[model samples]
Target chain A: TKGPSVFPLAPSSKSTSGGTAALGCLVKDYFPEPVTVSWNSGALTSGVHTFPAVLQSSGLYSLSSVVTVPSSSLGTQTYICNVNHKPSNTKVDKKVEPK
Target chain B: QPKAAPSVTLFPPSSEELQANKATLVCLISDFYPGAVTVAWKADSSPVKAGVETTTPSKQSNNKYAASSYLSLTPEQWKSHRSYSCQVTHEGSTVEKTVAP
Candidate 1:
């Protein structure tokens, strides 16, 4: 039925030298209950991040995660946004870079 | 009985369509009730690609269900017709749609 919907917002930080950054993922047209957003660095801990909910005009829920990561952590490390639902949904190994 | 989950449809992208040097693969799913669900992408049954993302309604609406996924890939990579599937897993059932492009 309603399949995985994913969109990438512009990367907030995109400098060669490491600096604070903001990146966003939009998961729209989804039912809110039983959904969780997770950010990972490919490490066992999967890193900790936070997402505050935003309302949309299409009667859908929008959420975003802003993490301050080092530029060194940009290329080598992996960032993932995982939504746990039935059959389990995951977005894996998306490399981060300037925009 | 529990309600049937919404269905996902992967509209095939045309060979002639303009593709970006960096492209995003999009899949849209619809018609779900009670809306509790998860959306994802699978390549050859594996999750290799990244920049996977999503959007959902903040509150329940007119019982309409919808969602999409944008997987960013190299233009060359997107051109290679690797099997991709859009999956919607809900409390009731798991629905999958595939595209060969």
Candidate 2:
């Protein structure tokens, strides 16, 4: 069976008063092929994006997904990334708060 | 301001015991100043959420702090042989260390 290991990356710098910020989730070294990534935010128009998982020399797979939101929409809102990998019956969540 | 960064080490499960049981991957963060560091675990690059336990930072004799986090997994999950990393965030700087299986 194969399962993914997940990690969350918060924005490097604090968001300006009314600017945009990006947070990311990394999924790595998973097996048995495809993985699904999703995001959740409270009633805000945020983007949930993912890149293709790269196959490394070690024969495992890794990938990343990011959520972009406007700072104005962040108050009391939290972002979560949910990942599901079937082979290992693994489901993981990565969460971050806007700064 | 120069701050002490936490050192991270990974303890992966051994193959000799894999046949009958599960494994625990531990991320040990030690010798860092200012007890407010964050520790996270990842398989490859993805953020892992479930089956994780973290300890509160404890004061060391030298005035620094130490903490640890662990991830539990099955042998089948371990068979993925993917890169596992421990990331420590301190004073806005994030340091990551990969585990050798």
Candidate 3:
């Protein structure tokens, strides 16, 4: 059993008048297949999207998840990616703000 | 964005140590930034997928990240004397280091 290492990517600002912004979380180097990734942002309007894990040349795996939020709600939302890798569980958080 | 490419090292079991026992080959990736890197193993230029394990990248004191991968093989496989290589990819740059038994 292998646990995943998780990290957050910088959120890109995409608008000024209530436009959309994308926030991402990266999960890597886990084994035994299939990890669960979920997102939370404190009731703010957002959608959680997950990508399938890709098997690397080294036989390990990597996956990513993204959340889309409105620019007007930036700086007021705390986003979290909760990961469950069986043997271990961890979560990574990011705050969206004006850049 | 500033990028620090990963440096790779390979450790293949020596003949003296693999006489009748199973052996493990290790690939170490170090001194990389941003923690986004990939590692792979090859035998005689063909990709290997069995008995492979890789750890998540860990942050070092210098703020760089390090990770490692291991491959287990039997003595019969080790006796082939084929070339084995560890390939690492970081920020669009890929590097390979080979070890021959």
Candidate 4:
């Protein structure tokens, strides 16, 4: 039975003050292949951030991405954290604001 | 074959089984029909960095997905009378299970 699994997954930072914020999703105990992480704000954008090569810890796989939002871009903007795992699609959204 | 929509259930260990610093707390969710589900721990309504784990869905005879989240906390935190919530979100709907310490 193949299905998507994500752990301790959360949306992008809710409040940021025009500075760099870190967003991450941890995956553990997954099989078959390592998952992919993507970032978006209602639409797909290119080159937001990238995670290092996958690695294992405590019997599970974990990965994370960091995005730096310009202070001018803050306010009522929502960023998304999406995970691509074969057999299912999982995504979470967070509100961006001045920290 | 018709697919059953996924549903979630949370069960915390009995109160007597709860102890400070030496025990593990668990939240179990079952019957997730869509299969895309995420579970995590929220302390006092905020995400916590500890005690969050997931299990791949195991197939039941009825063709449903079941999963759980496990957390380990110090006795002081559990006795501090804070609220711990187990949240599951799928397809825009969220289900949360909260227990008072």
Instruction: State which candidate has the highest TM-score.
Output: 3
Can you write out model 4's per-residue Cα lDDT over B8-82, one digit (the tens) per residue?
Answer: 333333332343223334555555676667776787878885656565555544566656556656656666647
Residue A26 CA error for candidate 2 (Å)? 27
Candidate 1: stretches off by over 4 Å: A1-99, B12-18, B58-61
Across residues B1-101, which tens digit of lDDT does each residue of candidate 2 receive? 34787765454544423544756565556678888888777878888866665656777667877776656677777668677777889989998877645
Candidate 4 error regions (>4 Å): A1-99, B1-7, B13-20
| Model 3: lDDT to the true structure | 0.64
Best by lDDT: 2
Clashes of each: 30, 16, 0, 10
Worst 10 residues of 1 chain A by lDDT: A42-51
List model 4 lDDT by residue over A1-99, tens digit each: 233333322222322233533333333334445566666742645424333323233444433333445433445455655666663444434232232
Candidate 4 clashing pairs? A16-A97, A16-A99, A17-A99, A18-A71, B5-B33, B6-B32, B6-B33, B7-B31, B20-B75, B21-B75
For candidate 2 chain B, the 10 contiguous residues with the lowest summed lDDT are B11-20
Each candidate's TM vs. the true structure?
A: 0.44, 0.47, 0.49, 0.45
User: Candidate 1's residue-wise lDDT over A1-99, tens digit each?
Assistant: 232354443343432124745443444345443345566542423323333343344444434333456655556655565554343353433333343
What does the lDDT read for residue B13 in candidate 4? 31
| lDDT (C-alpha) at residue A72 in model 3 | 60
What lDDT does each candidate get? 0.49, 0.65, 0.64, 0.49
